[PDB]
């Protein structure tokens, strides 16, 4: 649930519907331009101070890296 709310600020888009004469490759990149202003890290790297940038990279890393992404515990417990 934390990751679902982070997606918009981390350039993560869901699959879009495709009509006729439409290519997801040519559409997903268009959608990515719509939510370009929301992509946090790039924005801060563009207007932020080195200190702000460093703090943004660290926070962004912590936000995207969760146990559910590829780690589990019950196995180690046993």
């Amino acid at each position: 649930c934390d990751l679902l709310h982070a997606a918009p600020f981390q350039n993560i888009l869901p699959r879009v519907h495709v009509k006729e004469g439409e290519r997801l490759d040519a559409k997903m990149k268009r959608l990515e331009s719509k939510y370009a202003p929301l992509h946090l890290v790039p924005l801060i790297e563009r207007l932020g101070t080195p200190q702000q940038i460093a703090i943004a990279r660290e926070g962004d890393l912590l936000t995207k890296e969760r146990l559910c992404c590829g780690l589990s515990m019950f196995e180690v417990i046993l």
């Binding site: 890393l61 912590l62 890296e65 146990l67 992404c69 590829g70 780690l71």
Partner: peptide, 8 residues
Amino acid sequence: RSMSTFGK
């Protein structure tokens, strides 16, 4: 895709 934040 290793997660360094968890010490990996």
